[PDB]
Amino acid sequence: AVKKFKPYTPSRRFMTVADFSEITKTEPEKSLVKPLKKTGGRNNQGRITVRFRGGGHKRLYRIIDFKRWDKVGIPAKVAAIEYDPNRSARIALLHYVDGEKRYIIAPDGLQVGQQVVAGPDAPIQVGNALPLRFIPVGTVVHAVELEPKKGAKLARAAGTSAQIQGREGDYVILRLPSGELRKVHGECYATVGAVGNADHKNIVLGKAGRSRWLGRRPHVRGAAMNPVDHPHGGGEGRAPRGRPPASPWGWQTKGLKTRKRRKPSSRFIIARRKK
Amino acid sequence: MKRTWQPNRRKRAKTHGFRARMRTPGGRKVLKRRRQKGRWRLTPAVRK
RNA sequence: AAAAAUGUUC
RNA sequence: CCGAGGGUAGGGCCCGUGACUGGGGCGAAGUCGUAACAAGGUAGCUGUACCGGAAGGUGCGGCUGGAU
RNA sequence: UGGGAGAGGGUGGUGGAAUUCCCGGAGUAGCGGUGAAAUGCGCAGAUACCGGGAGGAACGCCGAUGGCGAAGGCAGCCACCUGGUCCACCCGUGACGCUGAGGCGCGAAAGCGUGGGGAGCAAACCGGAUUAGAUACCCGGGUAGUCCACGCCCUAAACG
RNA sequence: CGAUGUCGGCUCGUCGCAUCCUGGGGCUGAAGAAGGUCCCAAGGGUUGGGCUGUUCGCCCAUUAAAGCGGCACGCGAGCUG
RNA sequence: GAAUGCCGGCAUGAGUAACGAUAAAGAGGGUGAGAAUCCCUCUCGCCGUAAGCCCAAGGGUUCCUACGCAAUGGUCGUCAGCGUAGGGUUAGGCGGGACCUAAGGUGAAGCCGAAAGGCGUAGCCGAAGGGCAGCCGGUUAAUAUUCCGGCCCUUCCCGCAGGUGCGAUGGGGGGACGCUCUAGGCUAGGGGGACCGGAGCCAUGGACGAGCCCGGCCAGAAGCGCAGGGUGGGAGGUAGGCAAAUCCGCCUCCCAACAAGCUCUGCGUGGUGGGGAAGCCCGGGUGACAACCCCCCGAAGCCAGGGAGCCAAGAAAAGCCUCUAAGCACAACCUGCGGGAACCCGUACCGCAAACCGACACAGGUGGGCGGGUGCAAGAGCACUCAGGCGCGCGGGAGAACCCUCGCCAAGGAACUCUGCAAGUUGGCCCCGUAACUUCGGGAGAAGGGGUGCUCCCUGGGGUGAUGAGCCCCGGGGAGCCGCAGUGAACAGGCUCUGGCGACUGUUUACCAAAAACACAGCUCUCUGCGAACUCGUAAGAGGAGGUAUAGGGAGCGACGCUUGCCCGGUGCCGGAAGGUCAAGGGGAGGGGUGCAAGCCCCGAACCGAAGCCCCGGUGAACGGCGGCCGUAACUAUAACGGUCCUAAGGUAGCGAAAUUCCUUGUCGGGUAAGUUCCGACCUGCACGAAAAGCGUAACGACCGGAGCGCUGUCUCGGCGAGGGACCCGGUGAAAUUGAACUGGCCGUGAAGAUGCGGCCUACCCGUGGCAGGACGAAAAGACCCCGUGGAGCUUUACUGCAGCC
RNA sequence: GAGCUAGCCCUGGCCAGGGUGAAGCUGGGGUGAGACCCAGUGGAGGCCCGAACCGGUGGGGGAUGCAAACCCCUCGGAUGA
Ligand SMILES: [Mg+2]
Ligand SMILES: [Mg+2]
Ligand SMILES: [Mg+2]
Ligand SMILES: [Mg+2]
Ligand SMILES: [Mg+2]
Ligand SMILES: [Mg+2]
Ligand SMILES: [Mg+2]
Ligand SMILES: [Mg+2]
Ligand SMILES: [Mg+2]
Ligand SMILES: [Mg+2]
Ligand SMILES: [Mg+2]
Ligand SMILES: [Mg+2]
Ligand SMILES: [Mg+2]
Ligand SMILES: [Mg+2]
Ligand SMILES: [Mg+2]
Ligand SMILES: [Mg+2]
Ligand SMILES: [Mg+2]
Ligand SMILES: [Mg+2]
Ligand SMILES: [Mg+2]
Ligand SMILES: [Mg+2]
Ligand SMILES: [Mg+2]
Ligand SMILES: [Mg+2]
Ligand SMILES: [Mg+2]
Ligand SMILES: [Mg+2]
Ligand SMILES: [Mg+2]
Ligand SMILES: [Mg+2]
Ligand SMILES: [Mg+2]
Ligand SMILES: [Mg+2]
Ligand SMILES: [Mg+2]
Ligand SMILES: [Mg+2]
Ligand SMILES: [Mg+2]
Ligand SMILES: [Mg+2]
Ligand SMILES: [Mg+2]
Ligand SMILES: [Mg+2]
Ligand SMILES: [Mg+2]
Ligand SMILES: [Mg+2]
Ligand SMILES: [Mg+2]
Ligand SMILES: [Mg+2]
Ligand SMILES: [Mg+2]
Ligand SMILES: [Mg+2]
Ligand SMILES: [Mg+2]
Ligand SMILES: [Mg+2]
Ligand SMILES: [Mg+2]
Ligand SMILES: [Mg+2]
Ligand SMILES: [Mg+2]
Ligand SMILES: [Mg+2]
Ligand SMILES: [Mg+2]
Ligand SMILES: [Mg+2]
Ligand SMILES: [Mg+2]
Ligand SMILES: [Mg+2]
Ligand SMILES: [Mg+2]
Ligand SMILES: [Mg+2]
Ligand SMILES: [Mg+2]
Ligand SMILES: [Mg+2]
Ligand SMILES: [Mg+2]
Ligand SMILES: [Mg+2]
Ligand SMILES: [Mg+2]
Ligand SMILES: [Mg+2]
Ligand SMILES: [Mg+2]
Ligand SMILES: [Mg+2]
Ligand SMILES: [Mg+2]
Ligand SMILES: [Mg+2]
Ligand SMILES: [Mg+2]
Ligand SMILES: [Mg+2]
Ligand SMILES: [Mg+2]
Ligand SMILES: [Mg+2]
Ligand SMILES: [Mg+2]
Ligand SMILES: [Mg+2]
Ligand SMILES: [Mg+2]
Ligand SMILES: [Mg+2]
Ligand SMILES: [Mg+2]
Ligand SMILES: [Mg+2]
Ligand SMILES: [Mg+2]
Ligand SMILES: [Mg+2]
Ligand SMILES: [Mg+2]
Ligand SMILES: [Mg+2]
Ligand SMILES: [Mg+2]
Ligand SMILES: [Mg+2]
Ligand SMILES: [Mg+2]
Ligand SMILES: [Mg+2]
Ligand SMILES: [Mg+2]
Ligand SMILES: [Mg+2]
Ligand SMILES: [Mg+2]
Ligand SMILES: [Mg+2]
Ligand SMILES: [Mg+2]
Ligand SMILES: [Mg+2]
Ligand SMILES: [Mg+2]
Ligand SMILES: [Mg+2]
Ligand SMILES: [Mg+2]
Ligand SMILES: [Mg+2]
Ligand SMILES: [Mg+2]
Ligand SMILES: [Mg+2]
Ligand SMILES: [Mg+2]
Ligand SMILES: [Mg+2]
Ligand SMILES: [Mg+2]
Ligand SMILES: [Mg+2]
Ligand SMILES: [Mg+2]
Ligand SMILES: [Mg+2]
Ligand SMILES: [Mg+2]
Ligand SMILES: [Mg+2]
Ligand SMILES: [Mg+2]
Ligand SMILES: [Mg+2]
Ligand SMILES: [Mg+2]
Ligand SMILES: [Mg+2]
Ligand SMILES: [Mg+2]
Ligand SMILES: [Mg+2]
Ligand SMILES: [Mg+2]
Ligand SMILES: [Mg+2]
Ligand SMILES: [Mg+2]
Ligand SMILES: [Mg+2]
Ligand SMILES: [Mg+2]
Ligand SMILES: [Mg+2]
Ligand SMILES: [Mg+2]
Ligand SMILES: [Mg+2]
Ligand SMILES: [Mg+2]
Ligand SMILES: [Mg+2]
Ligand SMILES: [Mg+2]
Ligand SMILES: [Mg+2]
Ligand SMILES: [Mg+2]
Ligand SMILES: [Mg+2]
Ligand SMILES: [Mg+2]
Ligand SMILES: [Mg+2]
Ligand SMILES: [Mg+2]
Ligand SMILES: [Mg+2]
Ligand SMILES: [Mg+2]
Ligand SMILES: [Mg+2]
Ligand SMILES: [Mg+2]
Ligand SMILES: [Mg+2]
Ligand SMILES: [Mg+2]
Ligand SMILES: [Mg+2]
Ligand SMILES: [Mg+2]
Ligand SMILES: [Mg+2]
Ligand SMILES: [Mg+2]
Ligand SMILES: [Mg+2]
Ligand SMILES: [Mg+2]
Ligand SMILES: [Mg+2]
Ligand SMILES: [Mg+2]
Ligand SMILES: [Mg+2]
Ligand SMILES: [Mg+2]
Ligand SMILES: [Mg+2]
Ligand SMILES: [Mg+2]
Ligand SMILES: [Mg+2]
Ligand SMILES: [Mg+2]
Ligand SMILES: [Mg+2]
Ligand SMILES: [Mg+2]
Ligand SMILES: [Mg+2]
Ligand SMILES: [Mg+2]
Ligand SMILES: [Mg+2]
Ligand SMILES: [Mg+2]
Ligand SMILES: [Mg+2]
Ligand SMILES: [Mg+2]
Ligand SMILES: [Mg+2]
Ligand SMILES: [Mg+2]
Ligand SMILES: [Mg+2]
Ligand SMILES: [Mg+2]
Ligand SMILES: [Mg+2]
Ligand SMILES: [Mg+2]
Ligand SMILES: [Mg+2]
Ligand SMILES: [Mg+2]
Ligand SMILES: [Mg+2]
Ligand SMILES: [Mg+2]
Ligand SMILES: [Mg+2]
Ligand SMILES: [Mg+2]
Ligand SMILES: [Mg+2]
Ligand SMILES: [Mg+2]
Ligand SMILES: [Mg+2]
Ligand SMILES: [Mg+2]
Ligand SMILES: [Mg+2]
Ligand SMILES: [Mg+2]
Ligand SMILES: [Mg+2]
Ligand SMILES: [Mg+2]
Ligand SMILES: [Mg+2]
Ligand SMILES: [Mg+2]
Ligand SMILES: [Mg+2]
Ligand SMILES: [Mg+2]
Ligand SMILES: [Mg+2]
Ligand SMILES: [Mg+2]
Ligand SMILES: [Mg+2]
Ligand SMILES: [Mg+2]
Ligand SMILES: [Mg+2]
Ligand SMILES: [Mg+2]
Ligand SMILES: [Mg+2]
Ligand SMILES: [Mg+2]
Ligand SMILES: [Mg+2]
Ligand SMILES: [Mg+2]
Ligand SMILES: [Mg+2]
Ligand SMILES: [Mg+2]
Ligand SMILES: [Mg+2]
Ligand SMILES: [Mg+2]
Ligand SMILES: [Mg+2]
Ligand SMILES: [Mg+2]
Ligand SMILES: [Mg+2]
Ligand SMILES: [Mg+2]
Ligand SMILES: [Mg+2]
Ligand SMILES: [Mg+2]
Ligand SMILES: [Mg+2]
Ligand SMILES: [Mg+2]
Ligand SMILES: [Mg+2]
Ligand SMILES: [Mg+2]
Ligand SMILES: [Mg+2]
Ligand SMILES: [Mg+2]
Ligand SMILES: [Mg+2]
Ligand SMILES: [Mg+2]
Ligand SMILES: [Mg+2]
Ligand SMILES: [Mg+2]
Ligand SMILES: [Mg+2]
Ligand SMILES: [Mg+2]
Ligand SMILES: [Mg+2]
Ligand SMILES: [Mg+2]
Ligand SMILES: [Mg+2]
Ligand SMILES: [Mg+2]
Ligand SMILES: [Mg+2]
Ligand SMILES: [Mg+2]
Ligand SMILES: [Mg+2]
Ligand SMILES: [Mg+2]
Ligand SMILES: [Mg+2]
Ligand SMILES: [Mg+2]
Ligand SMILES: [Mg+2]
Ligand SMILES: [Mg+2]
Ligand SMILES: [Mg+2]
Ligand SMILES: [Mg+2]
Ligand SMILES: [Mg+2]
Ligand SMILES: [Mg+2]
Ligand SMILES: [Mg+2]
Ligand SMILES: [Mg+2]
Ligand SMILES: [Mg+2]
Ligand SMILES: [Mg+2]
Ligand SMILES: [Mg+2]
Ligand SMILES: [Mg+2]
Ligand SMILES: [Mg+2]
Ligand SMILES: [Mg+2]
Ligand SMILES: [Mg+2]
Ligand SMILES: [Mg+2]
Ligand SMILES: [Mg+2]
Ligand SMILES: [Mg+2]
Ligand SMILES: [Mg+2]
Ligand SMILES: [Mg+2]
Ligand SMILES: [Mg+2]
Ligand SMILES: [Mg+2]
Ligand SMILES: [Mg+2]
Ligand SMILES: [Mg+2]
Ligand SMILES: [Mg+2]
Ligand SMILES: [Mg+2]
Ligand SMILES: [Mg+2]
Ligand SMILES: [Mg+2]
Ligand SMILES: [Mg+2]
Ligand SMILES: [Mg+2]
Ligand SMILES: [Mg+2]
Ligand SMILES: [Mg+2]
Ligand SMILES: [Mg+2]
Ligand SMILES: [Mg+2]
Ligand SMILES: [Mg+2]
Ligand SMILES: [Mg+2]
Ligand SMILES: [Mg+2]
Ligand SMILES: [Mg+2]
Ligand SMILES: [Mg+2]
Ligand SMILES: [Mg+2]
Ligand SMILES: [Mg+2]
Ligand SMILES: [Mg+2]
Ligand SMILES: [Mg+2]
């Protein structure tokens, strides 16, 4: 339920903020926060290798559990639901009856104080983590591993979710958020339910400064540079692309596919993405 | 206005100092060449 | 289950 | 002190007029097509939407004020 | 008070038929289409037939000249929440009634916003015909939209 | 071409005369007035404004008249730009 | 003898410009060979959120003294940041190290690279971050939280006593965190006092006064008081914190719950130690047995790790506490007391600057803290002023032009000009008042207007305190006084209407462009299934991202509103197990060389054989493209209409002489006296047009236009005045430039613009202040143009390679 | 060679004073319940004015400079990209 502002500045008429209604706790768990080494988009050589990065708000990285098979059968309580600056989703704080405390990303519907568990025998219930094979066909899942015991890699962004469309051997057929149809291993864990905070995509950043708070530095069009800089550089006055629209490095950027043709996971993609 | 020389002893020693020179093949040659010339100062003098 | 328009004036 | 009024400034209503522009009305026998009236030759009409020299056409739904 | 009838309304769920796309088999020179054709599709293996799958939308028979709602309108099936309504007994209240400028709410379709969704259908648009022309009818495509959520719009041959 | 700074304006003038005005004439299809035209004449004078960078030009209001040219299309070791 | 030659020396310009902020000087006395310039005193002026003070960096003896004045000092010099000599920097507590980590760097393990080297987990290093013990005063010519005095504290070592399962680099807690706003109580700092202390003063008309002037504190251990921060207690279970755990984490139960208790800071008090002015006398002494008190104002600082709200969600690690592990429980640890022990480095001086960065004693640049008083609504603003520091290291005169900076101006009032450039105007606060339009915020400080000082009188509420006095803070009403003028000085919007462009705040060519350019939220296309795409790297390894399609890359467009048409023939891209072409390779008909030969060797056809291209389709918010000619209407005119040729399709909505219109100052209309501009229209649009977006759009703009009001020295049209220069004198004394010069006008001539030739004319010798027409004046071996088989940046369907990719 | 300059990383510091007055909260009104209306409180913002500070708009001076980019007047941002 994105929060609109009255137009009391130029930028406030479009600026919407998250409603933060599901958050129950406004300070991370100490035993779970490490410093997030900000990069500015620069590699170990020092070079900018992803452009227009930096200067965003300081952050603390919250350790998330993408391996909920680590604590099979040990139930846990949903202690809180918390903010996380490092992802689009909300993170849930779990008190395992072990006395172990872990963070997980918060699926939609998950209510503070409910019990969740992980394992083959888990109820098909919001926030439980079963191997893909033990989840019934037609179930909406998120935080899906892509290879057994390697960590939840799919459907972790706000509102995302994969769907189990059918089975075939040691593999189940998943419809990823992208609309791709993939074979993911049945022993791969997923968490039933979609990720919470669907409204995340309806947030209107509002002004340039907001983007800078996200660590996003200004983006310079190729069309505005000189021929030393960019295939779209130069021209007298404004100028159209004048060639197949291209990246700063020469390659075409309109339709040109770039997935490795001989990639071994091709055997596991049923149907390239939709739309 | 602000000019180019903004002296800083720590900077001077970490950039042009004897130890910085010896750490890289170029710096070693630098010292080598200044010794062969007979410089009185292989590295800049800075007080620490 | 219709091929095919139009028509000077009191 | 108030005070005719005069002055400076800013408003509201009304009227006349204005390059040009929009349709409207009318104008015995102009130009294009033939939409409607017979099932008017694709039944019509309708609110709406898009489109087309133009009447109109088409979609969606509605009405019979439709033939057999 | 005790009963009844009903596509009344909202939410969630769920069932089968059909169209489409995909996958497998099998299979050959046409298919499709019309007034007749052409466009289109098809030996790069279409159509037709079988199995599997994905998806969305609409509910055949019952079905009616029937039912319900104030109207717009409402049709598979299940449950939940809920409105109106008729009937019997003649129990209670004791005119508390009727209408209603404003106000408020509802309000088919189409349209609009933000999302989702998208099979079939289909304004716009394309192409094939027809034709003097054919910015139409008829044909092969096809985008909005049609569907869902929320919010607008507030129109009508909103008619008995 | 081991540099002669380019239009326009401003400022300062100075010269020419194919004279715009002013002085003097002849001819007139010169009645007068006022014109026309040619001749002599460079002494002095030759306005303020709107438009446009403009020169020029058009226009407004005047004027005796609102001359045309040369001076490195006079004049940036004077200014503007 | 020439090379804008090289080096040096010395000329010229020239006693010329200049002598570095216009804050400012004058006199007396001293010193001395010599004095505007040094010392002293008096007077005067300037800074005072500094031009004062204290830190940090940088500098490196510049510090203090004694003796000096050749050079340095833009003059002088007896002075000095200068020459010589001597002296000066004193710490367990300040700063840094013997503590901790941040980025980063480095790096046992490990990985990679022709070599050199590149990486890399831990670890180590790495500070202005964390952590940690000293405050006040005195002293030196020069150092002082450093020496001294007072009063305190830290750790290390040993011992004594008491208490305890002690013990760690291991577990855990804590350390530990943002931004804005902010409570209470304090302190720093300040104001006043009719109270306390003080040497005095009574002037020039008055005042012996509740007069004036001056000062009225500082540090402090325990205890105590005030204010705050931190913190539940117990029990039972336990599978988690990579061993263990009595700790922490999880569940239960009893009690406690604004508390209290325990603890830690702040502040006050506090034994005690200090300080202590004006004035006078020569840094000192007196004052002085100085007093040291009350009220108010009051932090941004302190209690603090306080509170609230927000979204962008806000280091680490040690110290410290706790838990247990080896071990050890004669130990060890904890607490208390005692004695001993406590190292290396810095410490001078400048430090918004004459000592640092700018070649200079350079009007520039340089982080942190303090920064007093009064008045002005507030403040670090502005004026003045304290403390303190300065008058800027050439002076003296004169009183021209001209220039700078400044003041004023009759009448006019933009007539100036490319343009109101510039300069006026406006100007704070309080009150009244405020339009189109609008996205309902705005526009808005719209516009416009009134008010503003001082005196007296009455009264309202606030803080403090006590509920009162006093002080202090917001006001309200009535009556008056004066001036040209009351925000009387200083600081402080001119305004309106209307287009263009860009939504907006932002960004930019450091040093000629701040814009309409870039950016921007937002929109679309596109790539990307995660060992992602993409980027950097030979690689390793990184970035992407400790992210996962609501995400990440690329590209265009650029808030928002309304929209974004038709062309897929070409080019791109995407799809297409057929067909065609196609390399290596396979294949090996068939030839060939050779040899007595077995054989060895070469050639080699069909045929199989990738991507790519061909080919078939799709695709425009991919590259892009969106016609011609002729005719036709009951007037002319013009064509809704037709004919035909071509196209892949022929430019739709909207807009249009435009940031686009050649002709052009188009035509018409508005505004003006007059309008190549401007605004509104028209539309035969040379050559708009729909995300290189089309058309609009409130708000915003040091953008660019047009108009009006206000006001002006912009101007008609200049005048006067000020100061700093220019001028004279004393001091010091450059520069570019310079073939040599004894360097005139005209008309000619001359390589075509002559001081230099001819002819004529003019002209005594030499300067000074001035002006710039000439010396084709200076400066820069023309930056335009061409030339060179010179160079470089950039492009591509130029050529040819290479990376990368298939 | 990043002691200038450009970006980023880490860790610190700075931003006088005044103006406007968003959400929310409270109370009242409102209704079947609502939306909502109002008042008070609240203190939001690449909000407003304006020092420090960061700038560098227009003009003037400067031009062998005080300065190889300075000075004066003016002007932009000043809780934020
Ligand atoms: Mg909003
Ligand atoms: Mg609103
Ligand atoms: Mg939330
Ligand atoms: Mg931690
Ligand atoms: Mg990272
Ligand atoms: Mg590195
Ligand atoms: Mg390196
Ligand atoms: Mg990159
Ligand atoms: Mg970057
Ligand atoms: Mg989050
Ligand atoms: Mg994310
Ligand atoms: Mg798998
Ligand atoms: Mg978005
Ligand atoms: Mg961020
Ligand atoms: Mg951009
Ligand atoms: Mg460019
Ligand atoms: Mg460019
Ligand atoms: Mg480059
Ligand atoms: Mg290149
Ligand atoms: Mg290029
Ligand atoms: Mg280009
Ligand atoms: Mg260019
Ligand atoms: Mg360009
Ligand atoms: Mg162009
Ligand atoms: Mg360009
Ligand atoms: Mg290209
Ligand atoms: Mg895919
Ligand atoms: Mg600089
Ligand atoms: Mg230098
Ligand atoms: Mg610096
Ligand atoms: Mg340093
Ligand atoms: Mg350094
Ligand atoms: Mg540095
Ligand atoms: Mg070094
Ligand atoms: Mg280095
Ligand atoms: Mg080497
Ligand atoms: Mg070596
Ligand atoms: Mg040397
Ligand atoms: Mg030596
Ligand atoms: Mg060296
Ligand atoms: Mg028919
Ligand atoms: Mg006809
Ligand atoms: Mg007839
Ligand atoms: Mg009156
Ligand atoms: Mg009168
Ligand atoms: Mg008809
Ligand atoms: Mg019909
Ligand atoms: Mg049609
Ligand atoms: Mg075929
Ligand atoms: Mg075949
Ligand atoms: Mg589908
Ligand atoms: Mg009925
Ligand atoms: Mg009864
Ligand atoms: Mg409706
Ligand atoms: Mg509808
Ligand atoms: Mg009916
Ligand atoms: Mg030349
Ligand atoms: Mg020369
Ligand atoms: Mg020259
Ligand atoms: Mg010259
Ligand atoms: Mg010359
Ligand atoms: Mg020229
Ligand atoms: Mg003039
Ligand atoms: Mg005459
Ligand atoms: Mg006559
Ligand atoms: Mg004359
Ligand atoms: Mg002309
Ligand atoms: Mg002209
Ligand atoms: Mg006359
Ligand atoms: Mg002339
Ligand atoms: Mg001539
Ligand atoms: Mg000239
Ligand atoms: Mg000429
Ligand atoms: Mg000419
Ligand atoms: Mg000339
Ligand atoms: Mg000239
Ligand atoms: Mg000039
Ligand atoms: Mg000129
Ligand atoms: Mg000259
Ligand atoms: Mg001259
Ligand atoms: Mg010679
Ligand atoms: Mg020379
Ligand atoms: Mg030479
Ligand atoms: Mg030489
Ligand atoms: Mg010599
Ligand atoms: Mg010499
Ligand atoms: Mg001389
Ligand atoms: Mg001389
Ligand atoms: Mg002289
Ligand atoms: Mg001279
Ligand atoms: Mg000079
Ligand atoms: Mg000088
Ligand atoms: Mg000077
Ligand atoms: Mg000054
Ligand atoms: Mg002054
Ligand atoms: Mg004197
Ligand atoms: Mg002297
Ligand atoms: Mg002397
Ligand atoms: Mg003195
Ligand atoms: Mg005196
Ligand atoms: Mg002061
Ligand atoms: Mg030095
Ligand atoms: Mg000397
Ligand atoms: Mg001497
Ligand atoms: Mg000597
Ligand atoms: Mg000297
Ligand atoms: Mg001297
Ligand atoms: Mg000097
Ligand atoms: Mg001397
Ligand atoms: Mg002497
Ligand atoms: Mg000393
Ligand atoms: Mg000590
Ligand atoms: Mg030691
Ligand atoms: Mg360390
Ligand atoms: Mg090495
Ligand atoms: Mg280091
Ligand atoms: Mg430290
Ligand atoms: Mg310390
Ligand atoms: Mg102390
Ligand atoms: Mg103990
Ligand atoms: Mg213990
Ligand atoms: Mg913490
Ligand atoms: Mg933290
Ligand atoms: Mg910290
Ligand atoms: Mg104190
Ligand atoms: Mg005070
Ligand atoms: Mg005390
Ligand atoms: Mg407890
Ligand atoms: Mg346990
Ligand atoms: Mg403390
Ligand atoms: Mg502060
Ligand atoms: Mg604090
Ligand atoms: Mg707090
Ligand atoms: Mg915030
Ligand atoms: Mg760390
Ligand atoms: Mg023992
Ligand atoms: Mg030691
Ligand atoms: Mg010291
Ligand atoms: Mg300064
Ligand atoms: Mg400072
Ligand atoms: Mg100094
Ligand atoms: Mg100083
Ligand atoms: Mg020096
Ligand atoms: Mg310099
Ligand atoms: Mg000086
Ligand atoms: Mg200086
Ligand atoms: Mg004071
Ligand atoms: Mg004030
Ligand atoms: Mg002076
Ligand atoms: Mg000064
Ligand atoms: Mg001076
Ligand atoms: Mg004189
Ligand atoms: Mg004289
Ligand atoms: Mg001055
Ligand atoms: Mg006067
Ligand atoms: Mg005047
Ligand atoms: Mg006037
Ligand atoms: Mg006027
Ligand atoms: Mg004017
Ligand atoms: Mg201009
Ligand atoms: Mg103008
Ligand atoms: Mg209004
Ligand atoms: Mg208006
Ligand atoms: Mg407007
Ligand atoms: Mg409004
Ligand atoms: Mg106001
Ligand atoms: Mg006003
Ligand atoms: Mg007075
Ligand atoms: Mg003012
Ligand atoms: Mg102002
Ligand atoms: Mg215009
Ligand atoms: Mg711009
Ligand atoms: Mg802008
Ligand atoms: Mg816009
Ligand atoms: Mg923008
Ligand atoms: Mg920048
Ligand atoms: Mg520039
Ligand atoms: Mg430049
Ligand atoms: Mg430059
Ligand atoms: Mg430069
Ligand atoms: Mg400039
Ligand atoms: Mg600007
Ligand atoms: Mg730019
Ligand atoms: Mg958009
Ligand atoms: Mg690369
Ligand atoms: Mg990686
Ligand atoms: Mg990472
Ligand atoms: Mg842009
Ligand atoms: Mg095409
Ligand atoms: Mg194509
Ligand atoms: Mg095609
Ligand atoms: Mg192939
Ligand atoms: Mg294009
Ligand atoms: Mg093209
Ligand atoms: Mg083309
Ligand atoms: Mg259209
Ligand atoms: Mg036009
Ligand atoms: Mg025009
Ligand atoms: Mg236009
Ligand atoms: Mg054009
Ligand atoms: Mg034109
Ligand atoms: Mg023209
Ligand atoms: Mg005209
Ligand atoms: Mg116009
Ligand atoms: Mg025309
Ligand atoms: Mg384009
Ligand atoms: Mg264009
Ligand atoms: Mg609008
Ligand atoms: Mg606008
Ligand atoms: Mg702007
Ligand atoms: Mg701006
Ligand atoms: Mg601007
Ligand atoms: Mg003047
Ligand atoms: Mg004077
Ligand atoms: Mg004399
Ligand atoms: Mg002299
Ligand atoms: Mg001298
Ligand atoms: Mg001679
Ligand atoms: Mg002469
Ligand atoms: Mg001569
Ligand atoms: Mg000649
Ligand atoms: Mg001559
Ligand atoms: Mg001769
Ligand atoms: Mg001669
Ligand atoms: Mg002569
Ligand atoms: Mg002289
Ligand atoms: Mg002179
Ligand atoms: Mg001259
Ligand atoms: Mg010459
Ligand atoms: Mg000349
Ligand atoms: Mg000359
Ligand atoms: Mg000249
Ligand atoms: Mg030059
Ligand atoms: Mg040369
Ligand atoms: Mg040359
Ligand atoms: Mg040159
Ligand atoms: Mg040229
Ligand atoms: Mg040439
Ligand atoms: Mg050649
Ligand atoms: Mg060449
Ligand atoms: Mg080259
Ligand atoms: Mg290569
Ligand atoms: Mg590629
Ligand atoms: Mg730097
Ligand atoms: Mg530096
Ligand atoms: Mg630096
Ligand atoms: Mg600030
Ligand atoms: Mg106010
Ligand atoms: Mg308020
Ligand atoms: Mg609140
Ligand atoms: Mg602001
Ligand atoms: Mg304001
Ligand atoms: Mg300037
Ligand atoms: Mg100059
Ligand atoms: Mg210069
Ligand atoms: Mg300045
Ligand atoms: Mg100023
Ligand atoms: Mg700003
Ligand atoms: Mg401001
Ligand atoms: Mg401020």
Author numbering:
A (entry chain 1D): 2 to 276
B (entry chain 17): 1 to 48
Question: What's the paper's own text on this?
Answer:
To understand the functional relevance of the C7 moiety of SAR in the context of the translating ribosomal complex, we have determined the crystal structure of SAR bound to T. thermophilus 70S ribosome containing mRNA, and P-site–bound deacylated initiator tRNAiMet at 2.80-Å resolution. In this experiment, we used mRNA containing phenylalanine UUC codon positioned in the A site of the ribosome. At 2.80-Å resolution, SAR can be unambiguously fitted into the obtained electron density map, including its C7 group. Our structure reveals binding of SAR in the canonical tetracycline site that is located in the A site on the small ribosomal subunit. The polar edge of SAR directly contacts h31 and h34 of the 16S rRNA by forming hydrogen bonds (H-bonds) with the sugar-phosphate backbones of nucleotides C1195 and G1197. Similar to other tetracyclines, the polar edge of SAR also engages nucleotides G1053, G1197, and G1198 via a coordinated Mg2+ ion. Unlike TET, but similar to TIG, SAR also coordinates a second Mg2+ ion to enable an indirect interaction with the phosphate of the nucleotide m2G966 of h31. Interestingly, despite the expected absence of a tRNA in the A site in our structure, we do observe continuous electron density corresponding to the A-site codon of the mRNA, indicating that mRNA nucleotides must be stabilized by macromolecular interactions. Close examination of the SAR binding site revealed that the third nucleotide (cytidine) of the A-site UUC codon (position +6) is in close proximity to the C7 extension of SAR. However, it is also evident from our structure that the methoxy group of the C7 extension of SAR forms a van der Waals contact with the cytidine in position +6, which is a weaker type of interaction compared to an H bond but still can provide additional stabilization of the mRNA, explaining why we observe strong electron density corresponding to the nucleotides of the A-site codon.
Tetracyclines inhibit protein synthesis by binding at the A site of the small ribosomal subunit and blocking the accommodation of an incoming aminoacyl-transfer RNA (aa-tRNA) into the A site of the bacterial 70S ribosome. More specifically, tetracyclines bind at the decoding center (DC) between the head and the shoulder of the 30S subunit, in a pocket formed by helices 31 (h31) and 34 (h34) of the 16S ribosomal RNA (rRNA). In this work, we determined two (2.8-Å and 3.0-Å) X-ray crystal structures of sarecycline bound to the initiation complex of the bacterial 70S ribosome and found that this antibiotic inhibits bacterial ribosome in part using a mechanism of direct mRNA contact, which has not been reported for any other tetracyclines so far. SAR is chemically distinguishable from other tetracycline antibiotics by the 7-[[methoxy(methyl)amino]methyl] group attached at the C7 position of the ring D.
